[PDB]
């Protein structure tokens, strides 16, 4: 919503500055987007009349003119605009003037002939950019007057954002009405006198959907001049409100729309077959709009049709051939009220957004159609001429909106606000807003006016009382409530503690978009169909990630393109894997995923430049899993993943539950995405490991311990962690520590076999151990390794 300030001050002119008025409009719930002047800054430009215009003797384009500006003599001006005649009233920038851009006007010769000034155009003054010619002023223009006094160019075009509520503030009257209640000043309304019909013609108008169109006013205007010029006062009032001048008929309908908030339309009477039928469209009925595009309408859409075809979308957009063209002479003015629930959504269903639909879907004043119809008729006749027939009134008083009767109790008022507002100040505010207020015992009962559509409950009156009283004049009071601790569980593992650990291990947290390129995601997870986004922001962001690796790997590529090979990052977020048995057909689990690459460290004088390998990432994961205290119950099993190298990939199990993956990206997938080298990735389901073991103290042995080493030779395919878990499970009465300190493959052991060097630490709380039971317990573990792994001792 854009409007002129001088137009607003014609209804209410408070004794405040423009910016003081803008902030006052902002504090009323109408955020101002900007306050811009109507034209550029300049001085020395005046009105003038060309007295003589002749051909330039040495320039076929130019014209030698003599212009009078009320001075002692006539000024010689050279101009090359095509619309430069002799009976014209122009805007003259005399000598000494300066235009936007510090364009000083000095006397000079133009192709030989003298010129003592310049004839201006709208673009040369910063008004608009209509550079088709120079300015054509009305014949009544006072000669010696400055252009800023005649055109009122000391004005500002205020732009405001009007929320879906406050539907009344979409016209000059609506904003001026609310500016009046903040200053407690009366509202000056122009005298809108009915015109009174002078001819007899009409046409049958029947509405078959009274619930959608409670009121429809039609009026025929016979014999008008469509090509009549729009007066300048109306061209500027429309231009200062963000509406260009088109034709004299549509400029009148746009003027009353901006002045009163009432949308209006004009048909060609001679192209209307039979009459007007305000009806719901047939399901599938097509209609050609003014822009040439066709619309296959639904039965939900209200249309203005005749007895044969459809002519327009009810209160949204006008048709192509049903409108006013360049040879029509008799028009039919539509001015109606449509139920907002019958107009909302239909425009966006067809990608339309008009001045009409935006106001009908929010609600226009149902006591306004007649006042606007009489103004449009008077303004149309005084511009295009003609004779107006009678007003066709098709009103259903039943389906009209009812003014609600709301009761406002003093109890809820000071409860929702917390600040006492005097009852004298409450009753005035509600009355100035147009409510019929009935005072009572600690209570009010107001009837919302006809133009308000957001007043339906008691709380709506609280917002109105408070916003007029001023939010900046309500004090602050800290909440007095209960101090209750809540539920804490020591067994919980904080995600922030895990991110802290990864920060202390050399990882940087990143955040990637949830929707990813399905081309890249299909390379990482082939054959899995992802949830797709119809009408997305982009096709490279049109697939809900089923893992965080697509965004992580895309991030390491983004940083490797900036001369940064070494990237250690991690992310936490939800994955979206489709599932029938999941709520909404999609299971959203919180995942923890990361990726490392490059050298293990940055270049250091005492640290070897080696590429990160598998055991570097696992060591970071074992540090994460060590927080849960369940690291003794974690197993890494080599399982196939299409995105991971088959020989260096691992599934992460916790007491039988696989909680994620860890491994190096497959070298073929590494060739794609052009990863600069070997990269390690992992992913973890957070809700599976977000619970830690609460400690319970055990008695420490006061007696010394004994360590024994064993050399166990097994097949190379035998996982070494399962041998350690067998030594620690067999020996539980005495074996308190099982650690592997060397793995040997080569000369001394047959090919396909390896020797594991394992240290056993034995200790008891009640005595000191001796070699009798020490060798017996060690032999108990050696035999257990031979029954499960066919192991041996070397």
């Amino acid at each position: 919503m854009k409007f002129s300030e001088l137009w607003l001050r014609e209804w209410v002119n408070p004794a405040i500055d423009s910016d003081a008025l803008a902030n006052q409009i902002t504090m009323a719930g109408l955020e101002v987007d900007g306050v811009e002047p109507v034209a550029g800054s300049f001085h020395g430009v005046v009105v003038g009349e060309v007295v003589e215009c002749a051909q330039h003797p040495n320039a076929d384009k130019l014209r030698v003119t003599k212009v009078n500006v009320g001075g002692d003599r006539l000024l010689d001006i050279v101009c090359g605009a095509p619309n430069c005649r002799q009976g014209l009233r122009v805007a003259v920038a005399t000598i000494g003037a300066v235009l936007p851009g510090d364009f000083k006007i000095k006397a000079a010769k133009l192709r030989g002939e003298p010129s003592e000034g310049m004839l201006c155009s709208f673009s040369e003054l910063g008004i608009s950019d209509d550079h088709s010619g120079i300015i054509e002023l009305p014949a009544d223009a006072p000669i010696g007057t400055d252009i800023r006094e005649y055109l009122k160019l000391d004005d500002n075009t205020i732009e405001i954002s009007v929320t879906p509520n406050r539907a009344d503030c979409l016209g000059i009257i609506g904003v001026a009405r609310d500016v009046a209640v903040l200053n407690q000043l009366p509202l000056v309304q122009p005298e809108i006198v009915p015109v009174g019909a002078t001819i007899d013609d009409t046409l049958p108008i029947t509405v078959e959907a009274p619930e959608a169109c409670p009121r429809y006013l039609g009026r025929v205007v016979k014999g008008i001049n469509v090509k009549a010029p729009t007066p300048l006062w109306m061209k500027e009032k429309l231009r200062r409100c963000g509406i260009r001048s088109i034709d004299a008929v549509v400029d009148v309908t746009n003027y009353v729309l901006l002045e009163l908030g009432q949308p209006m339309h004009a048909f060609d009477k001679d192209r209307i077959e039979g009459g007007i039928v305000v009806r719901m469209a047939k399901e599938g009925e097509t209609l050609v709009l003014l822009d040439g595009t066709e619309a296959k309408l639904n039965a939900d859409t209200l249309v203005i049709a005749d007895h044969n075809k459809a002519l327009a979308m009810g209160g949204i957009f006008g048709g192509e051939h049903s409108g006013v063209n360049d040879e029509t002479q008799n028009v039919l003015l539509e001015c109606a009220f449509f139920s907002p629930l019958s107009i909302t959504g239909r425009a966006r269903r067809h990608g339309l957004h008009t001045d009409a639909s935006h106001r009908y879907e929010r609600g226009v004043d149902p006591a306004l159609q007649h006042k606007a119809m009489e103004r449009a008729t008077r303004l149309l006749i005084d511009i295009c001429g003609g004779e107006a027939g009678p007003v066709i009134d098709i009103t259903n008083e039943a389906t009209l909106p009812k003014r609600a009767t709301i009761t406002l109790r003093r109890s809820k008022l000071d409860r929702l606000i917390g600040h006492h507002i005097a009852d004298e100040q409450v009753t005035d505010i509600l009355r100035r807003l147009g409510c019929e207020v009935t005072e009572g015992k600690d209570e009010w009962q107001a009837v919302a006016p006809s133009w308000r559509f957001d007043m339906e409950i008691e709380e709506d009156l609280v917002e109105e009382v408070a916003r007029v009283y001023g939010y900046n004049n309500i004090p602050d009071e800290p909440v007095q409530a209960s101090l209750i601790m809540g539920t804490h569980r020591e067994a919980d593992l904080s995600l922030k503690r895990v991110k802290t650990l990864l920060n202390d291990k050399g990882y940087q947290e990143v955040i990637t978009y949830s929707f990813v390129d399905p081309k890249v995601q299909q390379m990482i997870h082939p054959g899995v169909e992802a949830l797709l986004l119809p009408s997305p922001i982009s096709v490279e962001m049109s697939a809900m990630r089923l893992s965080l690796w697509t965004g992580l790997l895309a991030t390491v590529v983004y940083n490797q393109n900036r001369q940064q090979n070494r990237v250690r990052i991690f992310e936490s977020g939800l994955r979206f894997v489709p599932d029938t048995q999941a709520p909404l057909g999609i299971r959203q689990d919180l995942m923890l995923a990361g990726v490392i690459c490059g050298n293990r460290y940055e270049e250091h004088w005492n640290l070897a430049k080696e590429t990160v390998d598998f055991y570097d990432l696992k060591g970071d994961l074992e540090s994460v899993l060590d927080l849960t205290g369940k690291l003794n119950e974690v197993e890494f099993r080599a399982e196939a993943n299409p995105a991971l190298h088959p020989g260096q990939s691992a599934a992460i199990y916790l007491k039988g539950e696989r909680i994620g993956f860890v491994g190096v990206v497959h070298p073929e997938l590494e060739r794609k995405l052009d990863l600069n080298g070997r990269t390690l990735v992992f992913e973890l389901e957070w809700n599976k490991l977000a619970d830690r073991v609460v400690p319970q103290a055990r008695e420490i042995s006061r007696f010394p311990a004994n360590r024994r080493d064993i050399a166990v030779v097994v097949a190379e395919n035998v996982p070494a962690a399962d041998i350690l878990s067998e030594c620690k499970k067999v020996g539980v009465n005495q074996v308190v520590g099982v650690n592997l300190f060397d793995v040997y493959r080569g000369k001394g052991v047959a090919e396909g076999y390896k020797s594991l060097a394992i240290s056993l630490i034995l200790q008891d709380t009640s005595r000191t151990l001796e070699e009798e039971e020490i060798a017996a317990t060690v032999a108990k573990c050696v035999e257990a390794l031979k029954e499960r792994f066919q192991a041996s001792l070397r």
């Binding site: 055991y615 696992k618 060590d626 260096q648 400690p695 103290a697 420490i700 399962d722 592997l740 793995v743």
Partner: protein, 241 residues
């Protein structure tokens, strides 16, 4: 092509994580409980004068809880604090109500048994507002004990004496042995304490409380002897990672 197959079950390349002392874990828990209640954490020196540790708490020089307090002294004025009171006395003098603080720290007494150590940690809370009542002291303490042990356990409030509170009380939780077990002390702040810090007991009131950290840690994690905390056996501390 090439099969660089490795065993993924070998221990990873890492340094084993360290842990916090079991007293610190308990202290950080209670701070997180009262943190969500508006209780700021306050710290102060471990060496105090007789004013901030005795006199300002309605404990004159002749009072028994002073010489018979197992107190370490340096002069006739300087001493090792027996309570984190010097930091609460100083806060009440710097600001007016409302106050809502907890003051953890080390305190020193002169006994050394299985149940006593010459040094130990103490957590002392304090809240001073307008309508602070004894019903509030029961509520915020039953809330704490229910959450510290994560159990709806049996508690009881028992009359006691503290020179800086009246009404005074100690609370017990139903020990796992059938008998009661003293956990913490508390009480409404004494009007003489508020008087010499610039607070009028006619306008404001409040309650304070105190508890031993080694006490609640032995109950929570099942620690047998109290000397285990300060021996710092790595095998002992590695259980609280």
């Amino acid at each position: 092509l090439a099969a660089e197959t490795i065993d993924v079950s070998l221990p990873g390349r890492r340094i084993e994580n360290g842990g916090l002392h079991p007293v610190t874990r308990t202290i950080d828990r209670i701070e997180s409980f009262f943190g969500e209640l508006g209780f700021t954490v306050a710290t102060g020196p471990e060496i105090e004068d007789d004013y901030h540790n005795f006199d300002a708490l309605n404990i004159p020089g002749h009072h028994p809880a002073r010489a018979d307090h197992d107190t370490f002294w340096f002069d006739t004025t300087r001493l090792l604090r027996t309570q984190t009171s010097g930091v609460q006395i100083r806060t009440m003098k710097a600001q007016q109500p409302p106050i809502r603080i907890i003051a953890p720290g080390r305190v020193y007494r002169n006994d050394y048994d299985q149940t006593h150590t010459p040094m130990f940690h103490q957590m002392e809370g304090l809240i001073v507002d307008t309508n602070i009542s004894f019903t509030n002291l029961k509520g915020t303490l039953h809330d704490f004990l229910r959450n510290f042990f994560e159990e709806d356990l049996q508690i009881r409030f028992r009359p006691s004496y503290f020179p800086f509170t009246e009404p005074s009380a100690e609370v017990d939780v139903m020990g796992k042995n059938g008998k009661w077990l003293e956990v913490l002390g508390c009480g409404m702040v004494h009007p003489n304490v508020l008087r010499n810090v610039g607070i009028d007991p006619e306008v404001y009131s409040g309650f304070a409380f105190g508890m031993g950290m080694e006490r609640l840690t032995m109950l929570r994690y099942g620690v047998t002897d109290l000397r285990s905390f300060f021996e710092n056996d790595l095998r002992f501390l590695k259980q609280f990672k």
